[PDB]
Short mmCIF file of all heavy atoms in Angstrom, two decimals:
data_model
loop_
_atom_site.label_atom_id
_atom_site.label_comp_id
_atom_site.label_asym_id
_atom_site.label_seq_id
_atom_site.Cartn_x
_atom_site.Cartn_y
_atom_site.Cartn_z
N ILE A 254 -8.83 5.83 -12.02
CA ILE A 254 -7.96 6.05 -13.17
C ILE A 254 -8.30 5.00 -14.22
O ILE A 254 -8.72 3.89 -13.89
CB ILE A 254 -6.47 6.00 -12.77
CG1 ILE A 254 -5.58 6.49 -13.91
CG2 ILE A 254 -6.07 4.59 -12.37
CD1 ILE A 254 -5.75 7.96 -14.25
N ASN A 255 -8.10 5.35 -15.49
CA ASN A 255 -8.23 4.41 -16.59
C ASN A 255 -6.84 3.87 -16.90
O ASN A 255 -5.97 4.61 -17.37
CB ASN A 255 -8.87 5.08 -17.80
CG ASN A 255 -9.18 4.10 -18.92
OD1 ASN A 255 -8.61 3.01 -18.98
ND2 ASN A 255 -10.09 4.49 -19.81
N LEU A 256 -6.63 2.58 -16.64
CA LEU A 256 -5.32 1.96 -16.76
C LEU A 256 -5.44 0.65 -17.53
O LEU A 256 -6.48 -0.02 -17.48
CB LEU A 256 -4.71 1.70 -15.38
CG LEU A 256 -3.32 1.07 -15.36
CD1 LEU A 256 -2.30 2.00 -15.99
CD2 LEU A 256 -2.92 0.70 -13.94
N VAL A 257 -4.36 0.29 -18.23
CA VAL A 257 -4.29 -0.98 -18.94
C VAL A 257 -3.27 -1.86 -18.24
O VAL A 257 -3.63 -2.90 -17.66
CB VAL A 257 -3.92 -0.76 -20.42
CG1 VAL A 257 -3.78 -2.09 -21.15
CG2 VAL A 257 -4.96 0.11 -21.11
N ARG A 258 -2.00 -1.46 -18.28
CA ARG A 258 -0.94 -2.15 -17.56
C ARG A 258 0.01 -1.11 -16.98
O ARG A 258 -0.18 0.10 -17.16
CB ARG A 258 -0.19 -3.13 -18.47
CG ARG A 258 -1.05 -4.25 -19.04
CD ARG A 258 -1.46 -5.25 -17.97
NE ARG A 258 -2.26 -6.34 -18.52
CZ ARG A 258 -3.58 -6.34 -18.61
NH1 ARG A 258 -4.29 -5.30 -18.20
NH2 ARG A 258 -4.21 -7.40 -19.12
N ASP A 259 1.03 -1.58 -16.28
CA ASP A 259 2.03 -0.71 -15.64
C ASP A 259 1.28 0.23 -14.70
O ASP A 259 0.39 -0.23 -13.97
CB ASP A 259 2.87 -0.04 -16.71
CG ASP A 259 3.77 -1.01 -17.45
OD1 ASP A 259 3.96 -2.14 -16.95
OD2 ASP A 259 4.28 -0.65 -18.53
N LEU A 260 1.59 1.53 -14.67
CA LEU A 260 0.95 2.46 -13.76
C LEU A 260 0.78 3.80 -14.45
O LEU A 260 1.51 4.11 -15.39
CB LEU A 260 1.77 2.64 -12.47
CG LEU A 260 1.88 1.44 -11.54
CD1 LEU A 260 2.85 1.73 -10.41
CD2 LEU A 260 0.50 1.07 -10.99
N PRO A 261 -0.17 4.62 -14.00
CA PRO A 261 -0.31 5.96 -14.57
C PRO A 261 0.77 6.91 -14.08
O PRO A 261 1.46 6.66 -13.09
CB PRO A 261 -1.70 6.41 -14.08
CG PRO A 261 -1.88 5.68 -12.80
CD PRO A 261 -1.18 4.35 -12.96
N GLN A 262 0.91 8.02 -14.80
CA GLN A 262 1.88 9.06 -14.46
C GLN A 262 1.15 10.21 -13.77
O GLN A 262 0.26 10.83 -14.36
CB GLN A 262 2.60 9.56 -15.72
CG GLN A 262 3.70 10.57 -15.44
CD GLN A 262 4.50 10.91 -16.68
OE1 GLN A 262 4.30 10.32 -17.74
NE2 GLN A 262 5.42 11.85 -16.55
N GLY A 263 1.54 10.49 -12.53
CA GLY A 263 0.92 11.57 -11.78
C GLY A 263 1.47 11.60 -10.37
O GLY A 263 2.23 10.73 -9.95
N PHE A 264 1.05 12.64 -9.64
CA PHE A 264 1.47 12.84 -8.26
C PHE A 264 0.33 12.49 -7.32
O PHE A 264 -0.84 12.73 -7.62
CB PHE A 264 1.90 14.30 -8.03
CG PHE A 264 2.31 14.59 -6.61
CD1 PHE A 264 3.56 14.23 -6.15
CD2 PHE A 264 1.43 15.21 -5.74
CE1 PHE A 264 3.94 14.50 -4.85
CE2 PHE A 264 1.80 15.47 -4.44
CZ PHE A 264 3.05 15.12 -3.99
N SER A 265 0.68 11.91 -6.17
CA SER A 265 -0.30 11.48 -5.19
C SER A 265 0.25 11.69 -3.79
O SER A 265 1.43 11.43 -3.52
CB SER A 265 -0.69 10.01 -5.39
OG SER A 265 0.43 9.16 -5.19
N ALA A 266 -0.62 12.15 -2.89
CA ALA A 266 -0.28 12.34 -1.48
C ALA A 266 -1.23 11.48 -0.65
O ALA A 266 -2.44 11.74 -0.61
CB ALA A 266 -0.36 13.81 -1.08
N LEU A 267 -0.69 10.45 0.00
CA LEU A 267 -1.51 9.52 0.76
C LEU A 267 -1.88 10.12 2.11
O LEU A 267 -1.19 10.98 2.66
CB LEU A 267 -0.76 8.20 0.95
CG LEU A 267 -0.86 7.22 -0.23
CD1 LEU A 267 -0.23 7.81 -1.48
CD2 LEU A 267 -0.20 5.90 0.12
N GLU A 268 -3.00 9.64 2.66
CA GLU A 268 -3.54 10.16 3.91
C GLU A 268 -3.58 9.07 4.98
O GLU A 268 -3.65 7.88 4.65
CB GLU A 268 -4.95 10.71 3.72
CG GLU A 268 -5.01 11.94 2.82
CD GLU A 268 -6.43 12.43 2.60
OE1 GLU A 268 -7.38 11.71 2.98
OE2 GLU A 268 -6.60 13.53 2.03
N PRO A 269 -3.53 9.44 6.26
CA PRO A 269 -3.65 8.43 7.32
C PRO A 269 -4.94 7.64 7.20
O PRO A 269 -5.96 8.13 6.71
CB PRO A 269 -3.62 9.26 8.60
CG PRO A 269 -2.87 10.49 8.24
CD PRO A 269 -3.21 10.77 6.80
N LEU A 270 -4.89 6.38 7.65
CA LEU A 270 -6.06 5.51 7.70
C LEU A 270 -6.37 5.06 9.12
O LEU A 270 -7.42 5.41 9.67
CB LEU A 270 -5.85 4.30 6.78
CG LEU A 270 -6.98 3.27 6.74
CD1 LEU A 270 -8.26 3.90 6.20
CD2 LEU A 270 -6.59 2.07 5.91
N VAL A 271 -5.47 4.30 9.74
CA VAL A 271 -5.63 3.84 11.11
C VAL A 271 -4.26 3.78 11.78
O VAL A 271 -3.23 3.62 11.13
CB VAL A 271 -6.32 2.46 11.20
CG1 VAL A 271 -7.76 2.55 10.72
CG2 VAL A 271 -5.55 1.42 10.38
N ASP A 272 -4.28 3.91 13.10
CA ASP A 272 -3.08 3.76 13.93
C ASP A 272 -3.27 2.53 14.80
O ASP A 272 -4.24 2.44 15.56
CB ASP A 272 -2.85 5.01 14.78
CG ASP A 272 -1.56 4.95 15.57
OD1 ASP A 272 -0.80 3.96 15.41
OD2 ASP A 272 -1.29 5.88 16.36
N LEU A 273 -2.33 1.59 14.70
CA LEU A 273 -2.45 0.31 15.39
C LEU A 273 -1.26 0.10 16.32
O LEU A 273 -0.24 -0.47 15.91
CB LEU A 273 -2.53 -0.83 14.37
CG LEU A 273 -3.75 -0.81 13.44
CD1 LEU A 273 -3.63 -1.90 12.38
CD2 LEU A 273 -5.04 -0.98 14.23
N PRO A 274 -1.35 0.58 17.70
CA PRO A 274 -0.24 0.35 18.65
C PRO A 274 -0.11 -1.12 19.02
O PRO A 274 -0.43 -1.57 20.12
CB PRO A 274 -0.62 1.23 19.84
CG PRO A 274 -2.11 1.32 19.78
CD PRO A 274 -2.46 1.32 18.32
N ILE A 275 0.39 -1.91 18.07
CA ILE A 275 0.53 -3.35 18.27
C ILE A 275 1.86 -3.68 18.92
O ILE A 275 1.92 -4.20 20.04
CB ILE A 275 0.36 -4.10 16.93
CG1 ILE A 275 -1.06 -3.88 16.38
CG2 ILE A 275 0.62 -5.59 17.13
CD1 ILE A 275 -1.24 -4.34 14.95
N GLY A 276 2.96 -3.37 18.24
CA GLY A 276 4.29 -3.61 18.77
C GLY A 276 4.76 -5.04 18.68
O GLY A 276 5.26 -5.60 19.66
N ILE A 277 4.60 -5.66 17.51
CA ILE A 277 5.14 -6.99 17.24
C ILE A 277 6.13 -6.87 16.09
O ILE A 277 6.08 -5.95 15.27
CB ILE A 277 4.04 -8.02 16.90
CG1 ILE A 277 3.25 -7.59 15.66
CG2 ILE A 277 3.12 -8.22 18.10
CD1 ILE A 277 2.25 -8.62 15.18
N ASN A 278 7.04 -7.84 16.03
CA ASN A 278 8.06 -7.87 14.98
C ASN A 278 7.47 -8.46 13.71
O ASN A 278 6.95 -9.58 13.72
CB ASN A 278 9.27 -8.69 15.44
CG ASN A 278 10.04 -8.01 16.55
OD1 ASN A 278 9.98 -6.80 16.72
ND2 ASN A 278 10.77 -8.81 17.33
N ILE A 279 7.57 -7.71 12.61
CA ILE A 279 7.07 -8.15 11.31
C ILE A 279 8.26 -8.18 10.36
O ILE A 279 8.76 -7.13 9.94
CB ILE A 279 5.97 -7.22 10.78
CG1 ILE A 279 4.77 -7.23 11.73
CG2 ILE A 279 5.56 -7.63 9.38
CD1 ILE A 279 3.79 -6.10 11.50
N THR A 280 8.72 -9.39 10.02
CA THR A 280 9.79 -9.56 9.05
C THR A 280 9.30 -9.86 7.64
O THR A 280 10.10 -9.81 6.70
CB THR A 280 10.75 -10.68 9.48
OG1 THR A 280 10.02 -11.91 9.60
CG2 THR A 280 11.39 -10.34 10.82
N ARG A 281 8.02 -10.17 7.46
CA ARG A 281 7.50 -10.64 6.19
C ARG A 281 6.01 -10.36 6.12
O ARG A 281 5.35 -10.10 7.14
CB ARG A 281 7.77 -12.14 5.98
CG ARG A 281 9.25 -12.50 5.82
CD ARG A 281 9.47 -13.99 5.71
NE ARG A 281 8.88 -14.55 4.49
CZ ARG A 281 9.48 -14.54 3.30
NH1 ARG A 281 10.68 -14.00 3.15
NH2 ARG A 281 8.86 -15.08 2.25
N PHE A 282 5.46 -10.40 4.90
CA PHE A 282 4.04 -10.17 4.69
C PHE A 282 3.57 -10.98 3.50
O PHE A 282 4.37 -11.45 2.69
CB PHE A 282 3.75 -8.68 4.48
CG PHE A 282 4.47 -8.07 3.30
CD1 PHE A 282 3.89 -8.08 2.04
CD2 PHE A 282 5.71 -7.50 3.46
CE1 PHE A 282 4.55 -7.52 0.97
CE2 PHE A 282 6.38 -6.94 2.39
CZ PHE A 282 5.80 -6.95 1.14
N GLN A 283 2.25 -11.14 3.41
CA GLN A 283 1.63 -11.91 2.34
C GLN A 283 0.34 -11.23 1.91
O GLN A 283 -0.44 -10.78 2.76
CB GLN A 283 1.35 -13.35 2.78
CG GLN A 283 0.86 -14.26 1.67
CD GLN A 283 0.74 -15.71 2.12
OE1 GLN A 283 1.08 -16.05 3.25
NE2 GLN A 283 0.26 -16.56 1.23
N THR A 284 0.12 -11.15 0.60
CA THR A 284 -1.08 -10.54 0.05
C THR A 284 -2.16 -11.60 -0.08
O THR A 284 -1.98 -12.60 -0.78
CB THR A 284 -0.79 -9.89 -1.30
OG1 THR A 284 0.23 -8.89 -1.15
CG2 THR A 284 -2.05 -9.25 -1.87
N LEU A 285 -3.29 -11.38 0.59
CA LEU A 285 -4.41 -12.31 0.54
C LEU A 285 -5.34 -11.93 -0.61
O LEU A 285 -5.76 -10.78 -0.72
CB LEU A 285 -5.18 -12.30 1.87
CG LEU A 285 -4.41 -12.79 3.09
CD1 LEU A 285 -5.23 -12.60 4.35
CD2 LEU A 285 -4.01 -14.25 2.93
#
């Protein structure tokens, strides 16, 4: 998409990527 700021206007349907049977408690996250 050609974008400057904010976000474009449109519809999107996301698809599966991976399944990770981990089973740990996640209360927080951080973007690297």
Side-chain angles (χ1 to χ4, degrees):
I254 191 66
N255 187 339
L256 181 64
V257 177
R258 299 290 182 270
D259 291 345
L260 293 173
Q262 184 173 355
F264 178 80
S265 63
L267 277 63
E268 294 177 350
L270 179 62
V271 293
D272 185 3
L273 297 174
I275 297 169
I277 60 174
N278 291 336
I279 297 165
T280 60
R281 293 177 65 83
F282 59 90
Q283 187 174 356
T284 301
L285 296 174

